[PDB]
Each structure stands twice: as C-alpha cells, then as structure tokens.
Design an enzyme around this catalytic site. Structure first.
Site, short mmCIF file in Angstrom:
data_model
loop_
_atom_site.label_atom_id
_atom_site.label_comp_id
_atom_site.label_asym_id
_atom_site.label_seq_id
_atom_site.Cartn_x
_atom_site.Cartn_y
_atom_site.Cartn_z
CG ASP A 342 35.82 -5.35 -75.96
OD1 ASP A 342 34.79 -5.12 -76.63
OD2 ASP A 342 36.85 -5.84 -76.45
CG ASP A 683 41.00 -7.44 -75.62
OD1 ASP A 683 40.08 -6.94 -76.29
OD2 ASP A 683 41.01 -8.63 -75.27
CG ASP A 687 38.75 -1.47 -77.97
OD1 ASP A 687 39.55 -2.09 -78.70
OD2 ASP A 687 38.74 -1.57 -76.73
#
EC number: 7.2.2.13
Lengths: 989, 285, 31
Positions: A342, A683, A687
């Site tokens: 990410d 985080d 996702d």
C-alpha cells in the site's frame, strides 16, 4: 456472487434524483412516506454474517484430518472388548482402557489442532463505529435529530463538521465544508464539495459524499441516494464477509501429507487384514492385529508437533512485536511468491513533511534523520535562517500545549496538513516555534484561499530595535516569481536574470517531477520612509504593495517514505520476491514514491518515460521495451482477466494507482491466479477485502484502523517493514525446520510396523505391543520433535530461491524414501536385534522362534518347550514377552538418539554445523529419563505392561545406532562433495 | 494417469533406485545375521544366561483341555474320547518298550532317593544317562490300564506333571508339625502334593482322592532331578504323579486345586498355574 | 540361577538413573 460495479447516479441533476424517489428538495420527506419506504428498503444496519458456527468447528475438526483412523481403531478396541466378554474367560481391561486412551488421544488432537485453525474473522463489528446513531435530517422543512438505523433513502440530511454521514448522499448545496474520505481512496488529504459534476467517475465526482465519512470543516446538506446493503462500503463489507479465506500453503501441504499417509496406512492395513483372514485367524486376533497396524503406522503424535512448532515460531517472532492472529500465517509469509503493498502508512509516515528545498541556486535535501546525517544543509547561513523565519511565520496552525513529552515529528497539531508540515520542519530545524511566534507579533494578515493562491502576514523584526515591518508571503511558485523583483542569496540581495529565471524554472520542474506540490516563499521589508510604524493596516482595502517583491526560496513537502522501508524492500526483492504496489492515489506521486523507495530500480523506465525521452507517441513504441509499468485505475475497468494476467506476466515491476478497493481485490486475485502466493500489506478500510483474499494479510498496528488490523492474519505492532523481511526469512527457516521435524517423526513408524509384519509373516511372538506404540509416539517423538524447531538452518538462506508451491511439497516421494526406506529400516533392525538378544538370553534360540507363535499365545498350553529343553507356562512366558516389549521400546529410544543427531541438519554435518542447540541436548536427555522411569517404576507392569530389564540389555541398540549415524554422515559428505548429483536428486528430502 | 510408451512410469527407469535398495537391504541382512551370530557366540549351549524369568515350575497337568474343565458323560465313549486319545498319545513315549538298557536308559532308585547328579554342564562328557519310569508304578485301579483302561471308573486319571527346569533341584521342606498333615510322607525325597479345591466353603469334601506314583507316596521322586537340557539328556522322562477319584458325585461344578509344597517352590498372584494347579471336573449321566 | 536377578534393586537403580538424567537435562535449560 461477484459485486464490482459501485454504480451511482451522479450525472443526473438534483431535480431528477429528487423526483425519481418522489422526495422534496426543500421540504425533505413526510413521516408516512418515510415509514412506507422503510417498509420496503429496510433499515440502515448493514447485515451481519448470519452463519456463526459456535462449536461445530471443533466437531468438524475432530471428525476430519488424520483421525477417522483413530476413531476406527477405538471402535475396533471396543468391539474386541465386547468379543472377549462373550467367548473368552473373565474380561480383561487391557482393551477397554486402550480404547479409552485412544479416544482421549483423538480428543486431545482435535482440541489441540483447533488452536491453529481458528478463523479470527470479526469484520462485522468494526463498522458500527462509523455511521453514528444520531444524524441531523430535514423533514417537513424542520431540522430533526434522528436515529441512524431508521433513516431512509430520499430525505434531506445536513452535514456538519466532524459528523460522519449516515448514508451515501448527493449534496444539493455545499456550504464551504472540506471532506477527507480516508475510507475508499485511503488518504488524509481533504477534498472540496460542490454540486457540480466535476468528474464522470462517481468515485472522483465532487457532488457526492461517500458513506462513513464526515465533511471535516463546515456544514453541507444533501439527499440520500442509497443506504443499507445497497451502499458502496456496505457492498465492500458484504464482499469481504462472503469472500471467506483461502487455504494457507501450510494447510494445503498438511492436507496432502495427511491424505498420503492415511492412504498408505489404510492400504497396508486392509491388505494385511485380509492376509490374516486368509491365514485363518479368529475374529479377536484379526481385530487386535488391525488395531496394532492402525495405531503403529499412523503417527498420532505428529499433528501435535507442527502446531507447537508454529506456536514457538509465534513466540519467537512476538519479541519483535508481530501479533500473530492465525497460527498458520507464520508459514505463509515464508513463501510469498509476490508481495502487494500500500501507499499510505505502510511505506510512508501517513503525514506530509518537508523533504526538499532550494536556495542560493542550490538544492538541499531535508533529512528525515533527526541528527541531520550526511551534512544535509547549512544552519549558519543568513539565507537559511531567513527561510526558516518565513516558513515559521506563515503557518496558521498551533501545537497543542504541554505536549513536549513526545518527539516533534509525532506531535498532533490542529490545522492544514501543508502548514503543519512546514511548522514541524521549522520546529525540528530551529527550535521552539511558539517562542518564535511570540517574538514576532502579528499586526495584519490576509486569508489564504483557492481564488487567491497566496497568503501574506505583516510582522516585526526579531531585534526589538528598528522594528521594520516585514510582509511575509507564501503561495504557488509561479505567482511569487511573477511578483518577485530580487533574489536573496547569503543575506545579500541580487536582481533577477533571464538565466536565473530559467534556472528557477528548471529547479521547479525538477521538484515537480518528484510528484510534489511545490511552494514558493517571499518577504518584503516595508521602508519606513513610505510605510512608517504609524501606518494604518486593513484587510479588504489594499494599502500594501503586491508587485516588486523578492523571492527567497522554494519548499517541498512530499510525504516521506519510511526510514527502514528501502533497504527492506531491496532485501525482499533480492530474495526472489516480486513486489507490486497498489493504491488509490494519483499516479504521479505513486511513481515518484516507487522510484524513491526502490520498487522501480534505477535505469528502468515506463513506456511513457521512453516515449517522452524519444519524443515519440506511446503508440509507436513497443510496450515490451519497458519492464516497469504504471497504470491508472480508469483503464483497468476496460481490462479483462486475460489483460491483467498478461500485464502481470510481461511487466516485471508494476505500480498500480487510483484503484477502487474492489479493483484491488481483482488485482490480488489476478496475481494469485498465476500460481503465486500473494501477501498484501495495508492499513485502511479500503483494502479490508483484499487483506482477506491474500494468503497472508499484514496490517500496520499504530497507523492502521481497527478493521484493517482485525481482518489481517498478522499485525505489525512496531509498524516496521524490516519486521516483515525478518518474517519472510524466519518463515523460510520454519518451513525448512518443519521439513526436518516431520521426517524425524515419520522414521519411527517403520520400527513399529515391521514387528507386526514379521508377527504375521514369520509366526514369531509379538515383538512390539500396542500400548508401547502409544508410549513411543507420545513420549519419545514429542520432546525431540518440538526441540528440532529451535535450531537455525544452514547459512544458505541468503542465496535461496522462493519455494515453488507445486513441486517442493512438505512431504514428497524423496522424503518417504529417507524415512521409510533407509533410516526406518535400521530402527526396526535394531529393535529386532534387541528382541532376539533377550529372547535368546532366556532359553529361546533365535533359530527356533519361527513357527512358535501359534502355541506361544495359546492360553491352554502351559508346557511350551523352548530351545534349551525347559518348558514355560502361559504367564511365565508372557512376562518374558512383555520384558522384550520394554527392551524394544528402550532400543527405539537409543536409536532415536542417533536419528535426532543425523536429522538435525540437511546438508551441513554435525562436526561442521555443531551442536549449539541448548534445547536439543535437553530433549535427548529427556528421551532417556522417561524411558528409564516408565520401564522401572514399581506398580506399573500390572497396568502399563512395562517390566524392568537388566542393564546389559540397555546396550543392545548401541552397535546399530552407531551405524545409522555413520551412514547419514557419509551420505551428507557425498551430498556436499557432489552437488546436483543423483544422490541429491533421490535422497535430499 | 501414469502414461507409458511416452517417457515411462513417473519418469524413473526404475533401475538405479531399485538396485540401490536391493544392495542396501542385502547389506542390512548381512550385518544383521553377522550380529545375531556374534550374539549366538556369547551364549552357552548348556544353561540359559538368565533363569530368573523361570520361576519354581508351574505344576501343569498332562490331560490337555481347552476350557480348563473336564466334562463328559461316562456312558458315551465319544464324550471322553478326546481326553483318552490325548492321554494315550502323550504316554506312548513312557512305554517300557522305548526304555532299554545298554546306554539308552538306566535303572534308578525304587525308593525316592537323593537328587543324584551326572556331571558338569561342559561338553567334555557326552549324553548323560537318565533314570527310567516304567508304567508299572501306575495302578491302584485293579486293572492293567497303563496308558488308561478307558472305562468309566470315576474320572480319567488326570496325571499331573511338574514342569522341568534346566539345572533345578526341588528342595522338600524339613520341619516337624508343619502346615500340612499327610499320613504317608517323610520330610526328604518327597514333595507333598494334595488335591482339593475350596475345601469346606462350597466343596465340603465331595470326593476322596487317591494318589499313586513312584515310591507309594504322594510326591515327586527327587532322584530324577536335575534336568541337564535337551541336547545333553535326550529321551529324558521326568517324574509323574497319578490321581484318581472314587466317591465323586455328579451334577455339580467342583473346583479342585492340586498344589505341591516345597521350600524351593514359591507361589504368585497373577499366575494361576505356577506352582499350584487348578482344574474342574464335570460328570453327567 | 533361580534366585532373583536383583529385582527390587534394579528398580532403585533405574529410578536413580532416570532422576539423575532428568536433573542433568533440566540443568542445561537454566544454565
């Protein structure tokens, strides 16, 4: 079901959407209409997963796996006890107790393997935190506080600052409020709101406020367009819930290994059972022989070994603060054929800070390191201290009082992110910004806005004497350059030059190439001749000067990559692990951070980079030239499965940006479909589905939300990527260690099957009993097998290829060869040597034991002639047989000494790798302690069928355990001296 | 499926691995037989190394019975035919025809004598001689039955047989006014043997037992001991004792306990045939 | 030899051996 549309009627204007639900734009909706539409569309509470298995998981786990055979054996023990109580003499408890203890073994195995197969998925209760209960709605032209559960679609909902929206709504009128999504896109950057349809994509359109979000600064009203399960994030929640999980690589390997061993066990059992039936055994003899085969061949104390190995892995890695939720995940991180990453949080600090600056026609790198490592920039230059003054004064944010107990880079400050970054940089560089602002009193200021793109403030000088009025100015570089007239270098003031302006433009373009919003500073000292101390100051009426200013410096404030992320990413890539970056951010910043971190190596360029370098359109350049590719999220909607697979196959280092969460799940599924084992780190709440689909999901602890961390297989409490590289190395270690422990446990199976094979094929007294099989499996194959999990592997892990998920299985045909073929045969050979020694030390010569079993186990005969001529009664020779059972068990332990010594390492010899494991020695000593205690405790022979044996018989297994050690050392020497040979192919387990 | 005629059955060629395993198993068998021969070298051929597991011998009986109970109708020959055939098959070896002089057998004391030995266990001397056990000692039934007369004279004589142990001489008790009171018995050379099961609890002396063997006393003669092994004393006949019942009632399950006392004879708990001996007698008309 | 091969003595020796080996093994963990 698949849901990847997230379609919203953004393009339609306010009147059409108001009429399609027949809802008043200015009067809201009536109570009766709200009731009759709630009776149709249902309440707003998103549906929790209905299926909540309470204890059926434990029952299913005990019923399955490598047990069915144990339950069959227990049923056969009960059947044998039933037979013995209807035809034989007074019933004996030697079978009922065996069945009870076998049932205890299966229960403990089921409840012990339950510890690892615990699907800790509770994503339903992480969304009640959003969508607060009370929302301000506009019904019948009246403001009303209403519960968020019964709010319906098609009603005027107001939106204040700090109040999370109750449902997806299109704003009818925006009153100067800024919203920061931080849910689907996944950034802290605020976004403006306006009824105008700025973008065709509903995700990027500015006339909608997404569910579970608050318009941070201000108040705005709108009309709900959808609520409940028909919500984009409600759709995400349902997709995550119905996605379930994929079987972990260790789970697949264990399933295959159990299938293979159970198949072999049942095949051999049925084969020799029908052989015994053909030979003409009674039903009791046949069932007891079948029970013996089942309990011997099946390694009951094995699935309790891998679980403790994984638990010890978790305990070891928890000292680095890696809170492991799913016990299997510790293995998966080892494989990780690819790693998905990410943008915000995982690779950055999630907040913007100063990274670059420019002055004196020179670029200076702001140091993330606190000590200014590598002489980043000068601190005594007058131009630098002036620039610090300028950056400090223009801020419109203030640190919280009394928060000096935290390092300045980790202190929360209320205000804009840009000004927060500037003020943090000034605090880190110079010192206490509050005292600085106290020294320079403010007398006039101009607000900052998009329509202006500049802010200015009038302050005094630092020295109390000659308080010349300094007008500080901050804005876009181009506007400040246009308003500028002189340049400040080293305190002195020079005038602009065409070459100087060209150099400034070049530097500005270079900074903008880093995907950063560059700012320009300025400050003019008002002359006291025209602008004295007693000069009137205003805001709406202009009385200052706008042109003929003087540029001072540029300022760059990109969000920085993590301190330990670049080296760790390089290590992961050097380990053969491909890295894919996915996010929902802008492509320019994504590619800039990819280049900075190390995802895209130096010297490799994308297709557009080659096109720009060669001044040729992207159409005329072949995409095969560029190994690294970066794609937008707009063209992924027009991409099928084949296109995604082709992109993954051809391009070697990719970076995906501006992707919706469902698109992230599509990407991870495509990556996994190529046979890889994908690990996604993130985080945000966006996702959350992808974190479930990937074989192992990693979430950041401090910087991650509750939903992301509780939906992940492993949580990084320290929030470090070096932790994940240590994790993958340790996962490789634990896989290589499990491949040794499983081999160790399986070698003991042959010396427990072979005695039954000779008992049925040679007609000799039973060499190895049934209860002693339990004693061996759970007493001598537990402590050493677990202790094997501690030793570190060979030093080759630095130069190791990622595990191939379809050829390098946990147990293969080349490991059964090592256990069942060579190592196991020596075990049984030593056991039989002890058998024959002690049967020959009592009167039964080894040459006469054949053909004696028929009358040996007969109850009636009490005058069995031995070889020397004497005769024995039933119990008198059964005592000898039980003593020989004890001898067999002791010899098994003795040869397992050397078995452990030789199974410690795969390639390195014991003389080279060394016995540095402090727990292996304790385990080896524990093998002896329990063996001596269990074979010598008084009052145990009547229950456990364990008789004492003479000390000399302890030595029966010495000249065979020595042989296996020498043999394995010789094969390891051949292995080392001849790499890639036939020995390596057919014996390297 | 594992295709053939293309590359072969799961690769292989099945020669290198097969030859490796064959030679390895051959070496394993060779080392195993070498080790077992070496172990055979360190054990004597005249005495077990550890005779502890052999206890004071179990007083097994000669008539072999499966359910440890003798049930038969005296009027039907097939009822006791199994017992009769087993007894005669066992006692065919004890016939006087098989026992002959001239270094085959030897005469031995009629009165129970001392436990005479024959020599050391060493092979410097060949097959040592043994006494002879003629069938003429058995009798007291007023008929030449030898093996067994076969009539329904009470019960088929369940002749007991104290098990033989290599190099073990039983020691008869030596005391006055012992725990047992046999009318015809002397302390040396005789091991007292009595036959009664659960006397005075439920049996209440159903029948009278008559003992006949060697020496006209209810005991095993001591002159036969000690046994010298199968290799050194072929055709060895061990002492036998015969028991008969006359006033034995029918239609009742009577346990009978035949035990042999001795200072060198010890009893146990989990073993129901060591030292002392148990059997049931069932007769129905 | 019909007299006990040491029984009730080999049990004591075996228990002593077991406990001393357990003590030696458990010593190494702490040290």
């Amino acid at each position: 079901l698949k849901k990847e549309v997230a379609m919203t009627e953004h393009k339609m204007s306010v009147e059409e959407v108001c009429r399609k639900y027949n809802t008043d734009c200015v009067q809201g909706l009536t109570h009766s209409k709200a009731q009759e539409i709630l009776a149709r569309d249902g309440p707003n509470a998103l549906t929790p997963p209905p299926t909540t298995p309470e204890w059926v998981k434990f029952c299913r786990q005990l019923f399955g796996g490598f047990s069915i055979l144990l339950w069959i054996g227990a049923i056969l023990c009960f059947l044998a006890y039933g037979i013995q109580a209807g035809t034989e003499d007074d019933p004996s408890g030697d079978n009922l107790y065996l069945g009870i203890v076998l049932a205890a073994v299966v229960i403990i195995t089921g409840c012990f393997s339950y510890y690892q197969e615990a699907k800790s998925s509770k994503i339903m209760e992480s969304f009640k935190n959003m969508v607060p209960q009370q929302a301000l709605v506009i019904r019948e032209g009246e403001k009303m506080q209403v519960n968020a559960e019964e709010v319906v679609v098609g009603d005027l909902v107001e939106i204040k600052g700090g109040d999370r929206v109750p449902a997806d709504l299109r704003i009818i009128s925006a009153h100067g409020c800024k919203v920061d999504n931080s849910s689907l896109t996944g950034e802290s950057e605020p976004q403006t709101r306006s009824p105008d349809c700025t973008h065709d994509n509903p995700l990027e359109t500015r006339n909608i406020t997404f569910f579970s979000t608050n318009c941070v600064e201000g108040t705005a009203r709108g009309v709900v367009v959808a609520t409940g399960d028909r919500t984009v994030m409600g759709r995400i929640a349902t997709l995550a819930s119905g996605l379930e999980v994929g079987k972990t690589p260790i789970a697949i390997e264990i399933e295959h290994f159990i299938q293979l061993i159970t198949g072999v066990a049942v095949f051999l059992g049925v084969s020799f059972f029908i052989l015994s039936l053909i030979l003409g055994y009674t039903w009791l003899e046949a069932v007891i022989f079948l029970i013996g085969i089942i309990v011997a061949n099946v390694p009951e104390g094995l699935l309790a070994t891998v679980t403790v190995c994984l638990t010890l892995t978790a305990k070891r890695m928890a000292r680095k603060n890696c809170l492991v939720k799913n016990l299997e995940a510790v293995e998966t991180l080892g494989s990780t054929s690819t790693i998905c990453s990410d943008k915000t949080g995982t690779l950055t600090q999630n907040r913007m800070t100063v990274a670059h600056m420019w002055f004196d026609n020179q670029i200076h790198e702001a140091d993330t390191t606190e000590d200014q490592s590598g002489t980043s920039f000068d601190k005594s230059s007058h131009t630098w201290v002036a620039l610090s003054h300028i950056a400090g004064l223009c801020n419109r944010a203030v640190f919280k009082g009394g928060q000096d107990n935290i390092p300045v880079l980790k202190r929360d400050v209320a205000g804009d992110a840009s000004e927060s970054a500037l003020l943090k940089c000034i605090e880190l560089s110079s010192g206490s910004v509050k005292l600085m602002r106290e020294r320079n009193k403010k007398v006039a200021e101009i607000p900052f806005n998009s329509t202006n793109k500049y802010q200015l403030s009038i302050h005094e000088t630092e020295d109390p004497n000659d308080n010349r009025y300094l007008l500080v100015m901050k804005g876009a570089p181009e506007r400040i350059l246009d308003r500028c007239s002189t340049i400040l270098l080293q305190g002195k003031e020079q005038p602009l030059d065409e070459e100087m302006k060209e150099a400034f433009q070049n530097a500005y373009l270079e900074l903008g190439g880093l995907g950063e919003r560059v700012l320009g500073f300025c400050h003019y000292y008002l002359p006291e001749e025209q602008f004295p101390k007693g000069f009137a100051f205003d805001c709406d009426d202009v009385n200052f000067t706008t042109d003929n200013l003087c540029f001072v410096g540029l300022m760059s404030m990109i969000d920085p990559p993590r301190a330990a992320v670049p080296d760790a990413v390089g290590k992961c890539r050097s380990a053969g692990i491909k890295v894919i970056m996915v996010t929902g951010d802008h492509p320019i910043t994504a590619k800039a951070i990819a280049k900075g971190v190390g995802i895209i190596s130096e010297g490799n360029e994308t297709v557009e980079d080659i096109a720009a370098r060669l001044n040729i359109p992207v159409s005329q350049v072949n995409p095969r030239d560029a190994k690294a590719c970066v794609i937008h999220g707009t063209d992924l909607k027009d991409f099928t499965s084949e296109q995604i697979d082709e992109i993954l196959q051809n391009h070697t280092e990719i970076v995906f940006a501006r992707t919706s969460p469902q698109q992230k799940l599509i990407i991870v599924e495509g990556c996994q479909r190529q046979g890889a084992i994908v690990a996604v780190t993130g985080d945000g709440v966006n996702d959350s589905p992808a974190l479930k689909k990937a074989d192992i999901g990693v979430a950041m602890g401090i910087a991650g939300s509750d939903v992301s961390k509780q939906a992940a297989d492993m949580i990084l409490l320290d929030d470090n990527f070096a932790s994940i590289v240590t994790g993958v190395e340790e996962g490789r270690l634990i896989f290589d260690n499990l491949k040794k422990s499983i081999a160790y446990t399986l070698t003991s199976n042959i010396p427990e099957i072979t005695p039954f094979l000779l008992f049925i094929m040679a007609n000799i007294p039973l060499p190895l009993g049934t209860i002693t099989i339990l004693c061996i499996d759970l007493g001598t194959d537990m402590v050493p097998a677990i202790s094997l999990a501690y030793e570190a592997a060979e030093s080759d892990i630095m130069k190791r290829q990622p595990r191939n998920p379809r050829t390098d299985k946990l147990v293969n045909e080349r490991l059964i060869s090592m256990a069942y073929g060579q190592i196991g045969m020596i075990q049984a050979l030593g056991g039989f040597f002890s058998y024959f020694v002690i049967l020959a030390e009592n009167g039964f010569l080894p040459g006469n034991l054949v053909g004696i079993r028929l009358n040996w186990d007969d109850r009636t005969v009490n005058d069995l002639e031995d070889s020397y001529g004497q005769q024995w009664t039933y119990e008198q020779r059964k005592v000898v047989e039980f003593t020989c059972h004890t001898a067999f068990f002791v010899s098994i332990v003795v040869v397992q000494w050397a078995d452990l010594i030789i199974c410690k390492t795969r390639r390195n010899s014991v003389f080279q790798q060394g016995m540095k494991n402090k727990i292996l020695i304790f385990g080896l000593f524990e093998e002896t302690a329990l063996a001596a205690f269990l074979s010598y405790c008084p009052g145990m022979d009547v229950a456990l069928r364990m008789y004492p044996l003479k000390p000399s018989w302890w030595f029966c297994a010495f000249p065979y355990s020595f042989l296996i050690f020498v043999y394995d050392e010789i094969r390891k020497l051949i292995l080392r001296r001849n790499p890639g040979g036939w020995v390596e192919k057919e014996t390297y387990y | 499926s594992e295709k053939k005629e293309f590359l072969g059955r799961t690769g292989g060629s099945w020669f290198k691995i097969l030859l490796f395993y064959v030679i390895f198993y051959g070496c394993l068998a060779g080392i195993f037989i070498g080790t077992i021969q070496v172990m055979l070298l360190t054990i004597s051929e005249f005495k077990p190394t550890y005779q502890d597991r052999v206890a004071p011998p179990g007083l097994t009986q000669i008539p072999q019975i499966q359910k440890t109970e003798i049930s038969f109708r005296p009027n039907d020959p097939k009822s006791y035919e199994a017992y009769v055939l087993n007894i005669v098959r066992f006692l065919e070896k004890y016939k006087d025809s098989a026992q002959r002089d001239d270094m085959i057998f030897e005469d031995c004391g009629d009165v129970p004598s001392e436990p005479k030995e024959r020599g050391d266990f060493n092979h410097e001397r060949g097959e040592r001689k043994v006494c002879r056990f003629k069938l003429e000692w058995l009798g007291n039934c007023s008929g030449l039955n030898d093996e067994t007369y076969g009539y329904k004279e009470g019960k088929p004589c369940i002749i007991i047989k104290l098990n033989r142990v290599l190099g073990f001489k039983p020691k008869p008790p030596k005391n006055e006014s012992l725990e047992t009171y046999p009318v015809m018995k002397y302390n040396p050379n005789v091991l007292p043997v009595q036959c009664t099961g659960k006397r005075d609890e439920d049996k209440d002396k159903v029948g009278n037992v008559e003992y006949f063997g060697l020496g006209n006393s209810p005991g095993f003669p001591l002159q036969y001991y000690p046994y010298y092994g199968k290799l050194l004393q072929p055709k060895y006949l061990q002492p036998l004792l015969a028991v008969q019942f006359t006033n034995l009632t029918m239609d009742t399950e009577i346990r009978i306990e035949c035990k042999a006392y001795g200072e060198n004879i010890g009893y146990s708990e989990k073993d129901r045939f060591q030292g002392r001996f148990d059997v049931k007698i069932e007769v129905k008309s | 030899d019909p007299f006990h091969y040491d029984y009730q003595t080999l049990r004591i020796g075996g228990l002593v051996f077991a406990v001393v080996l357990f003590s030696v093994g458990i010593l190494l963990i702490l040290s």
